[PDB]
Amino acid sequence: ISEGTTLKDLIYDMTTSGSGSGLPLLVQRTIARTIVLQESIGKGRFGEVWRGKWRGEEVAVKIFSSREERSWFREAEIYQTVMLRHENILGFIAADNKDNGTWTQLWLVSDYHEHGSLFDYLNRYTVTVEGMIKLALSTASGLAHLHMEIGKPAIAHRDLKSKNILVKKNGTCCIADLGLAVRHDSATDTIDIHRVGTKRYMAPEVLDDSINMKHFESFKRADIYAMGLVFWEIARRCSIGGIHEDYQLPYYDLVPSDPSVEEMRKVVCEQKLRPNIPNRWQSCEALRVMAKIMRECWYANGAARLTALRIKKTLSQLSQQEGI
Amino acid sequence: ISEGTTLKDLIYDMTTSGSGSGLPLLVQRTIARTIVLQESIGKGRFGEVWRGKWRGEEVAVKIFSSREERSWFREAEIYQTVMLRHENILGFIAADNKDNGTWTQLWLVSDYHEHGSLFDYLNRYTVTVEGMIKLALSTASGLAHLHMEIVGTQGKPAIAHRDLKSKNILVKKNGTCCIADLGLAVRHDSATDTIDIAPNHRVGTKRYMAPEVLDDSINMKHFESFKRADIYAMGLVFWEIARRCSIGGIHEDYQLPYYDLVPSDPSVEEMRKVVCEQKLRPNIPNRWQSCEALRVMAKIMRECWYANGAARLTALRIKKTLSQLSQQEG
Amino acid sequence: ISEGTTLKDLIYDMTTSGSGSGLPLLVQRTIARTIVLQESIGKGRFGEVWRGKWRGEEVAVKIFSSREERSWFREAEIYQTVMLRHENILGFIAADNKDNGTWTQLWLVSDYHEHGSLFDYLNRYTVTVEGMIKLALSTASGLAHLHMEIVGTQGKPAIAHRDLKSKNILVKKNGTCCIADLGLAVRHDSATDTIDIAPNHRVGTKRYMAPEVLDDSINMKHFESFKRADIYAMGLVFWEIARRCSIGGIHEDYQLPYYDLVPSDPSVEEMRKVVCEQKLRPNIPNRWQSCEALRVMAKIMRECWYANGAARLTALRIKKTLSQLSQQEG
Amino acid sequence: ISEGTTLKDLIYDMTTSGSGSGLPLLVQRTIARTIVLQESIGKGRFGEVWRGKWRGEEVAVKIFSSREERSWFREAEIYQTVMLRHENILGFIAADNKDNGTWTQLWLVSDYHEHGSLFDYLNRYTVTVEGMIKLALSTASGLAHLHMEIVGTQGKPAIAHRDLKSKNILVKKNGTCCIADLGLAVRHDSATDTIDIAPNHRVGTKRYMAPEVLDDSINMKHFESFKRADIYAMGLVFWEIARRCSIGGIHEDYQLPYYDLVPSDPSVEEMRKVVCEQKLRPNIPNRWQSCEALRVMAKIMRECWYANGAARLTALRIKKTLSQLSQQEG
Amino acid sequence: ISEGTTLKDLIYDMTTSGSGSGLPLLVQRTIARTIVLQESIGKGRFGEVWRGKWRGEEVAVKIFSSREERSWFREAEIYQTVMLRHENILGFIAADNKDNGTWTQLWLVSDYHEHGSLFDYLNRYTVTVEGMIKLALSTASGLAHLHMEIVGTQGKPAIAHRDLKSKNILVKKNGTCCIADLGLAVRHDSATDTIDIAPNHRVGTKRYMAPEVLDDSINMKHFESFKRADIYAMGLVFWEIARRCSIGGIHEDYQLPYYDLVPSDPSVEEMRKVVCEQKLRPNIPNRWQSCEALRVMAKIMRECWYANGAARLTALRIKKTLSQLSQQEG
């Protein structure tokens, strides 16, 4: 990387001429080992996420704990091997490793989004009907692209939630955290594979353990159910005429912080309960369309739920009718 | 192979790659020299098979004796060269070598199947009529794929095993099989009508040698001769299988073919007298007329044991009729 | 580069090179580090431009200040990665770097034009009606080529200059022009609908900044916004040109646009008031109604100065109508 | 060439490869420098031919004399560059060099044929009418392939042997032949109408030199001239063959062409008088009118011995009519 | 280059497969630095031409004077950059350089023609009517090929010699010719209408300079101007040739064009007066009306000497009509 080169230049180059594939390993290494960390931004099972700068420009750095090397590799593997680039998917920049044994240092580098996670964004703000559409549409667009097979294999996130989604300056979203993701090669009907993910968003089939992990579709479906819970968190903060609910996680009133697999299973599987869809949401077209989707996402039977592409389509429709 | 990489990842990548080729030699080397052997699993002419682990995940390692280098190369050659790969064929992972002269260490690495060889499996168990079909069908499917020629790029030449037997077959968790040990295998390039033979003379376990092979009347100029000998032995294997097919508590004790007509470790001559001269074959039990399945099987076995090779069934044939019998079950 | 090689040879080879490539980095380096500087020719935000010689032949060398490395890279980047080669665009020859840290030396090498910038040229001369057309036509031709997008191997993305002006234009021996200084240029990949300089402020010479740019109402999300700002400034340039078009001894003295409505080195605010608020434009002399040429030009200038960018003429448009006028006289 | 690799494996791989090409220089070197010579097999202008073994398997090694480097290169060049491989052409395996100056050691390696040259074979045996056909057909097939030009990448230029004779032909286990010794061979690129040599001389075994060659009236500007001379000699060879075709115990003793009209090691002049002047040819025995085969052969021989080259049969022609005679009785 | 390699082999390879117009630089270097000079053959502005041998085989070596590096490069550049290889153009083999500064040694290597230049050849001999045709036809063929433009990548640009004369033409063993010395040659890329010029002032031997060149009225903006000047000189050459065409013992003594109207080593001015002013041309002998051949030639010469270039015949034209006459004899 010569003098004057900027992050933008790099990204632009892989994005255009790059031909699906990303920066050269040597370049990734150089970027990584030449970044300057600012401060921490968040944690997780993996490790910590930091806000860093590369030659002035901001960037996000996920630093893994030596004992979490599998997550580091898995996620980098899915990004690079697949050449999975998309407006609504956290933009991968580089991967790198540094020490030996116990002190091995594993990093991943991506675009930086000052707004943080959708979770933080919704706790900090309320949103326009237009704003709500932007967020939901983008999120659906991304999940649609992940599930879509092309080229690239189909991918199931396996851990969707407001905290794994980031919001850009332009009020759009991008899925993030592919550490638990699963791939499906149709041409071989194989899936490099154990219930994982945040309990609060686990789908019904997943909770009672009735899910068939032999059919890749099972995973795509569980993704939709959670994406529905996310749309719920969003619409809740869609303020029309000063009226809006306070930010709340799904099932915030039916189960304790840090729900157990059992606590969740009782409310979701047994009691067959779902987040409460407010009455006022019948107000405008938008709120209705959304409420509609949410229901067609929460079905106990997965094969009955809507598909990501489906939601992207109908949500894309509601958007043109809004002149967005 | 970087941190966090798992065996699954590796396999997945070669599997879902543009080339039917396998892992890069450097990767094979690294895997090999980084495996951790557990304990022995079995022996043979080649050397020993061990159960090993690579970063925790289990794997099988065939360690050859320096003096058996030809078998090591031959088998690795057949696997890599033609991107052989099939559900019913032991999955090759890597090959590697280590020392010099006398102490050269030759290894081969493949998938691990906790059940061991069909031989061990039958000695340890008895099986369902359905179970018996699974085993025979799968075995036939594999031998079919080996014998099958596919002209073109990602195609493969026809291959004759030359040493089939319950001990060279492995059984998976799902009660399926996969042929193994291609050290004596022979290739046939139709487009050149050329047959390559590393061990040109008679080879293989005496007990399963076909008639043409025993009296030495076989024409090793016609590749077909080899495919046929394979069938005869596959017949003996089906015999060992059906014998343990317990229907209503009734079943025979495990027994190798010709267990009553010849001593352990039969000589080429002892075998030739019973098979060629006396024209004897394993005894097909009377009760095997009981159900459809047992009959179909007994049928095949006979159409496999013909003294005249050209008269025997083909692997694809057996795969077909056995695939049929399967359809009407479960 | 071997003995006897001349600059001409090099240029001819890349030019005539079927494969749309410029010179090999190693050759660029050698040329650069083997040039012999003569003396300074001009300055700017970037650094200084020098007239130098490579094995006798003249050439221009833009030497950047260490602290201006981004401009150096940006400009070289746009030239090389795109193949951008055009009769009416300063001809790029090579780029190179030399020291470390504080004393890093960044160079760029191009064709040498003894006439200098259009600015110097107009201050030194007056011009024929034919002369005026040559200059305006060529300039338009170049801006047209920059803005033009082409999908294909030897194709190029669309590019917006973002800092057009008489001082960034050079005039050749044959009275033609060529745009120069692509340090602020922006690229647009249609097939991805993506920009180059993603987060940008307001750049360029204040005096020529377009209205949308001055009040900051410009939409930097639509690439077109930039093309339009380029036209507005190109209009101011045509103005500087026509002003020196002497027909029968009558002609105005050279003057920069808005020379009478704002101080030397105008501030963003001083300019915004005169251009945005007072809605003023350079004064289009009365005599310019004299001949066809002067009228065509005055016409364009107005259709370039519109407050609303989407209302302005396009580069290709001006190139066409100006090509016509130049056609009405040989 | 790892452990366990065998010659067969190597040959099989190059053979069954769409590359149509041969072994990597590094592999050739390794084979060459790792071969173990057994003993001498024959001599010639070039040097000596030895029977050697590579890891047990037999192979032939032609060791040239330092002063004969041109023959070494020339032959290896024609084999490798051209990608020349054919059932009826000695199979090239490798080429290598070793010392410096005076003691430079130049080697060539090929398949080994225990039967030796046709010359030795005919001196040691007599042959069936069928046998005679096999030999003549194969030889023609090879010469046909050499002379044949092919435009595709799997194709090659036309080649003239320039030194055909029973001593340069080898006989395989299956009673077939293969031309050998391409040290004097000439190439013809039709697409450029160019030759591979400086025919500035006269080469080859005197005894088989064609008429045009002897009197020196041959036009070495027309590649055809060479093909024709090849046919004349191939005729002399068919003569040596038919002579030993024993039908009912009756057959002549092996004899070289012109054995009765000129001394051992004939001079260019001695030969020219008998062939050019006296216009003599080998005597075609009366009994050869006995059967069809002998007649067909005698026919060819005459249509090969014409004084005028352009009048002689072509290799493909002979291959065709000889292929006919053959197919009438497998 | 390994043992046994011969010059022929090298040439054949580049001629045939070698995609790059010619041999690999490393091979060129080796050849050059391994040649053995015999003795001098001639001089010129460039330097000296020597007869040398590479591994015995003869070859020509043009050794340039350090101060003439531009000619060395220019000529090598024109040869290599285009694959320019034609029967009637001196065959390029290699280029190489050796020392530093003042003692830099620049070489060029080509085929050797024992006959030397047409100039020497005509001074040493007289020629047949057939012989004369051979020489004129060949020369025209070559100049035709140089002037001819071919658009594919397997094509080339049009080239003007700019210094044709009996001393820059060589005669082969077969009485044919080949143009030589492309040091002043000029290239024309039609697809860009660019005239790659070496020295942009009048160059070449005064005695053969065309009229337009002498008075300096030539338009060096139109590539055609150069092709035309080439024809005028080629006409003077045909004159020098016919002069030595002896029919029945009658023939003139060798003489350079304008040998009687101007001093040895004519000045630009001396020539201009006789050619431009006095409008004089070489005297076309009366006897040349004798036979068809001599007339055809005299015809051409006149249609080559026109004061107006655009009026002269084209190389292809002359090649055609001369090719016709050639066929009217055999």
Curated annotation (Swiss-Prot), chain A:
> Can you cite an annotated GO cellular component?
nucleus
- Gene behind this protein: TGFBR1
Answer yes or no on keyword Isomerase: no
Q: Which residues of the full protein are shown?
A: 171 to 501 of 503
Q: Name one GO biological process term.
A: anterior/posterior pattern specification
Family indicated by similarity: Belongs to the protein kinase superfamily. TKL Ser/Thr protein kinase family. TGFB receptor subfamily.
In its record, the post-translational modification comment is: Phosphorylated at basal levels in the absence of ligand. Activated upon phosphorylation by TGFBR2, mainly in the GS domain. Phosphorylation in the GS domain abrogates FKBP1A-binding. N-Glycosylated.
The covalent link annotated as Glycyl lysine isopeptide (Lys-Gly) (interchain with G-Cter in ubiquitin) occurs at K98
User: What does UniProt list as catalytic?
Assistant: D159
What name does UniProt use for this protein?
TGF-beta receptor type-1
